[PDB]
Design an enzyme around this catalytic site. Structure first.
Site, PDB file in Angstrom:
ATOM      1  N   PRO A 111       0.722  -1.197   0.126  1.00  5.70           N
ATOM      2  CA  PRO A 111       0.063  -0.023  -0.023  1.00  5.70           C
ATOM      3  C   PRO A 111       0.935   1.248   0.044  1.00  5.70           C
ATOM      4  O   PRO A 111       1.667   1.132   0.668  1.00  5.70           O
ATOM      5  CB  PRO A 111      -0.658   0.007   1.275  1.00  5.70           C
ATOM      6  CG  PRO A 111      -0.001  -1.052   2.264  1.00  5.70           C
ATOM      7  CD  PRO A 111       0.917  -1.936   1.231  1.00  5.70           C
ATOM      8  N   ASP A 112       0.436   2.342  -0.749  1.00  3.07           N
ATOM      9  CA  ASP A 112       1.073   3.511  -0.732  1.00  3.07           C
ATOM     10  C   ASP A 112       0.516   4.477   0.458  1.00  3.07           C
ATOM     11  O   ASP A 112      -0.769   4.708   0.277  1.00  3.07           O
ATOM     12  CB  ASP A 112       0.601   4.080  -2.293  1.00  3.07           C
ATOM     13  CG  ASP A 112       1.260   5.418  -1.998  1.00  3.07           C
ATOM     14  OD1 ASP A 112       2.049   6.002  -1.108  1.00  3.07           O
ATOM     15  OD2 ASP A 112       1.002   6.199  -3.098  1.00  3.07           O
ATOM     16  N   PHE A 113       1.286   4.881   1.344  1.00  2.00           N
ATOM     17  CA  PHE A 113       0.676   5.585   2.536  1.00  2.00           C
ATOM     18  C   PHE A 113       0.134   6.825   2.038  1.00  2.00           C
ATOM     19  O   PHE A 113      -0.375   7.605   2.905  1.00  2.00           O
ATOM     20  CB  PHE A 113       1.933   5.650   3.464  1.00  2.00           C
ATOM     21  CG  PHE A 113       2.910   6.630   3.063  1.00  2.00           C
ATOM     22  CD1 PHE A 113       3.802   6.610   2.292  1.00  2.00           C
ATOM     23  CD2 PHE A 113       2.742   7.981   3.657  1.00  2.00           C
ATOM     24  CE1 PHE A 113       4.854   7.531   1.918  1.00  2.00           C
ATOM     25  CE2 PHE A 113       3.755   8.915   3.312  1.00  2.00           C
ATOM     26  CZ  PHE A 113       4.786   8.652   2.356  1.00  2.00           C
ATOM     27  N   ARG A 114       0.575   7.434   0.782  1.00  2.00           N
ATOM     28  CA  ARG A 114       0.182   8.777   0.547  1.00  2.00           C
ATOM     29  C   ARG A 114      -1.197   8.617  -0.310  1.00  2.00           C
ATOM     30  O   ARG A 114      -1.698   9.592  -0.561  1.00  2.00           O
ATOM     31  CB  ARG A 114       1.124   9.328  -0.651  1.00  2.00           C
ATOM     32  CG  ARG A 114       2.228   9.903   0.247  1.00  2.00           C
ATOM     33  CD  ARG A 114       3.219  10.391  -1.100  1.00  2.00           C
ATOM     34  NE  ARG A 114       4.126   9.335  -1.417  1.00  2.00           N
ATOM     35  CZ  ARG A 114       4.735   8.863  -2.533  1.00  2.00           C
ATOM     36  NH1 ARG A 114       4.865  10.119  -3.297  1.00  2.00           N
ATOM     37  NH2 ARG A 114       5.263   7.961  -2.891  1.00  2.00           N
ATOM     38  N   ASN A 127      12.422   1.242  -3.097  1.00  2.00           N
ATOM     39  CA  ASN A 127      11.402   1.007  -2.219  1.00  2.00           C
ATOM     40  C   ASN A 127      11.997   0.702  -0.769  1.00  2.00           C
ATOM     41  O   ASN A 127      13.104   0.230  -0.607  1.00  2.00           O
ATOM     42  CB  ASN A 127      10.873  -0.653  -2.564  1.00  2.00           C
ATOM     43  CG  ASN A 127      10.318  -0.272  -4.134  1.00  2.00           C
ATOM     44  OD1 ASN A 127       9.927   1.165  -4.438  1.00  2.00           O
ATOM     45  ND2 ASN A 127      10.433  -1.300  -4.952  1.00  2.00           N
ATOM     46  N   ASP A 161       9.884  -1.721   1.045  1.00  2.00           N
ATOM     47  CA  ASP A 161       9.194  -2.958   1.482  1.00  2.00           C
ATOM     48  C   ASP A 161      10.180  -4.015   1.582  1.00  2.00           C
ATOM     49  O   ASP A 161       9.768  -5.130   2.234  1.00  2.00           O
ATOM     50  CB  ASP A 161       8.273  -3.080   0.295  1.00  2.00           C
ATOM     51  CG  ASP A 161       8.785  -3.470  -1.307  1.00  2.00           C
ATOM     52  OD1 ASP A 161       9.837  -3.858  -1.357  1.00  2.00           O
ATOM     53  OD2 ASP A 161       8.252  -3.013  -2.136  1.00  2.00           O
ATOM     54  N   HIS A 190      16.253   4.581  -0.024  1.00  5.12           N
ATOM     55  CA  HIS A 190      15.465   5.194   0.726  1.00  5.12           C
ATOM     56  C   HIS A 190      15.594   4.474   2.277  1.00  5.12           C
ATOM     57  O   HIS A 190      14.672   4.671   3.194  1.00  5.12           O
ATOM     58  CB  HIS A 190      13.914   5.285   0.437  1.00  5.12           C
ATOM     59  CG  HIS A 190      13.526   6.311  -0.365  1.00  5.12           C
ATOM     60  ND1 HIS A 190      13.207   7.495   0.036  1.00  5.12           N
ATOM     61  CD2 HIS A 190      13.687   6.474  -1.805  1.00  5.12           C
ATOM     62  CE1 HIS A 190      12.992   8.511  -0.857  1.00  5.12           C
ATOM     63  NE2 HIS A 190      13.415   7.722  -2.068  1.00  5.12           N
ATOM     64  N   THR A 216       9.398   2.519 -12.292  1.00  2.00           N
ATOM     65  CA  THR A 216      10.081   3.772 -11.575  1.00  2.00           C
ATOM     66  C   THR A 216       9.396   5.197 -12.484  1.00  2.00           C
ATOM     67  O   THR A 216       9.556   4.994 -13.702  1.00  2.00           O
ATOM     68  CB  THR A 216      11.172   3.817 -10.926  1.00  2.00           C
ATOM     69  OG1 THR A 216      11.565   5.233 -10.818  1.00  2.00           O
ATOM     70  CG2 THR A 216      12.519   3.492 -12.066  1.00  2.00           C
ATOM     71  N   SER A 217       9.052   6.141 -11.807  1.00  2.36           N
ATOM     72  CA  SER A 217       8.715   7.316 -12.816  1.00  2.36           C
ATOM     73  C   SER A 217       9.877   8.086 -12.856  1.00  2.36           C
ATOM     74  O   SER A 217       9.579   9.020 -13.524  1.00  2.36           O
ATOM     75  CB  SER A 217       7.478   8.041 -12.047  1.00  2.36           C
ATOM     76  OG  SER A 217       7.796   8.309 -10.657  1.00  2.36           O
ATOM     77  N   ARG A 229       5.507   1.581 -17.233  1.00  4.45           N
ATOM     78  CA  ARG A 229       4.003   1.915 -17.917  1.00  4.45           C
ATOM     79  C   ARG A 229       4.496   2.742 -19.052  1.00  4.45           C
ATOM     80  O   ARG A 229       3.694   2.950 -20.023  1.00  4.45           O
ATOM     81  CB  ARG A 229       3.038   2.526 -17.145  1.00  4.45           C
ATOM     82  CG  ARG A 229       2.053   3.021 -18.025  1.00  4.45           C
ATOM     83  CD  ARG A 229       0.741   3.403 -16.940  1.00  4.45           C
ATOM     84  NE  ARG A 229      -0.367   3.656 -18.141  1.00  4.45           N
ATOM     85  CZ  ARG A 229      -1.615   3.973 -17.492  1.00  4.45           C
ATOM     86  NH1 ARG A 229      -1.927   3.836 -16.020  1.00  4.45           N
ATOM     87  NH2 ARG A 229      -2.303   4.223 -18.573  1.00  4.45           N
ATOM     88  N   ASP A 230       5.507   3.944 -18.785  1.00 12.04           N
ATOM     89  CA  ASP A 230       5.716   4.942 -19.703  1.00 12.04           C
ATOM     90  C   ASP A 230       6.945   5.107 -19.792  1.00 12.04           C
ATOM     91  O   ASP A 230       7.786   4.932 -19.056  1.00 12.04           O
ATOM     92  CB  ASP A 230       4.752   6.272 -19.400  1.00 12.04           C
ATOM     93  CG  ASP A 230       5.077   6.495 -17.773  1.00 12.04           C
ATOM     94  OD1 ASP A 230       5.611   5.713 -16.968  1.00 12.04           O
ATOM     95  OD2 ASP A 230       4.675   7.681 -17.327  1.00 12.04           O
TER      96      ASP A 230
END
Ligand SMILES: [Mg+2]
Ligand SMILES: [Zn+2]
Length: 271
Positions: A35-38, A109, A111, A128, A200-201, A225-226
């Site tokens: 889950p993303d906390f944001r 991450n 996680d 991180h 990653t974005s 994705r992109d």
């Protein structure tokens, strides 16, 4: 592009890529249900709204931590090892390691799923930070993350056995330096003969611009994705993008490598 996904696979099959550096972000762990906390409407987000926080990110701010560490420890409890499981993307990286091809895995991450999939700490740069170790906020004594596990799972703020200060997981907070091992980029990136970017974005520096640190003779393969960040902004001739769902992209690469059976067996051993 001058190179295809299959060309990259063939380089790997020919053993021309013995020193693969990998960069990964949140996109690789979405399939694990992290889950993303944001993100509004996660249990973690809703859970965090019982604390007097100005915004969810305050849980990574030191002045808030020392006012009240409980919100941060709510996230620690949710993401502590054991709750979530690696997915095929993680196991693909474990296979790279087993095949002796992984030079280093740079992850955004927290996680800890890279470690869970069996990648040794010495192959990881957790940019991180991590829940695998912790440090007393008062006397600076280091501890393994296992030493505070029980407190975390019982909603007790873990305290140092020497000075009784709060023991904080080695997760990077706002304003803090990057972990020491981030500077392994200085040796890894010039040495890499392939760069893999997954999920990653590439929005955050200095992690994003590591993509520029490999040599121009070296392919950069993006599975995402992109097309994003420096890869979009400063494209190079040997860049390859496999755009779409990350798991589908990884499975395509596994097929082009001819690693279907090994993936099957690995995943079965680990699960
Ligand atoms: Mg104790
Ligand atoms: Zn202490």
């Amino acid at each position: 592009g001058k190179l295809s996904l299959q060309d990259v696979a063939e380089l790997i099959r020919a053993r021309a890529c013995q020193r693969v550096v990998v960069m990964v972000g949140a996109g690789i762990s979405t399939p694990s249900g992290i889950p993303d906390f944001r993100s509004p409407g996660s249990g973690l987000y809703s859970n965090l709204q019982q604390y007097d926080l100005p915004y969810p990110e305050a849980i990574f701010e030191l002045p808030f931590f020392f006012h009240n560490p409980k919100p941060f420890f709510t996230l620690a409890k949710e993401l502590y090892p054991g709750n979530y499981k690696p997915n095929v993307t993680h196991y693909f990286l474990r296979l790279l390691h087993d095949k002796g091809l992984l030079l280093r895995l740079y992850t955004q991450n927290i996680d800890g799923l890279e470690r869970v999939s069996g990648i040794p700490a010495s192959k990881l740069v957790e940019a991180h930070g991590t829940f695998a170790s912790a440090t007393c906020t008062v006397c600076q004594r280091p501890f393994p993350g296992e030493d505070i596990r029980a407190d975390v799972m019982a909603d007790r703020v873990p305290r140092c056995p020497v000075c009784t200060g709060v023991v904080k997981p080695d997760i990077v907070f706002f304003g803090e330096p990057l972990p020491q091992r981030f500077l392994l980029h200085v040796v890894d990136f010039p040495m890499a003969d392939l760069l893999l970017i997954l999920g990653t974005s590439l929005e955050v520096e200095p992690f994003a611009s590591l993509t520029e640190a490999v040599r121009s003779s070296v392919p950069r393969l993006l599975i995402n994705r992109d097309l994003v960040g420096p890869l979009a902004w400063h494209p190079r001739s040997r860049d390859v993008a496999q755009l779409g769902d990350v798991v589908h992209g990884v499975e395509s690469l596994v097929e082009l490598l001819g690693w279907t059976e090994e993936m099957r067996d690995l995943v079965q051993r680990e699960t």
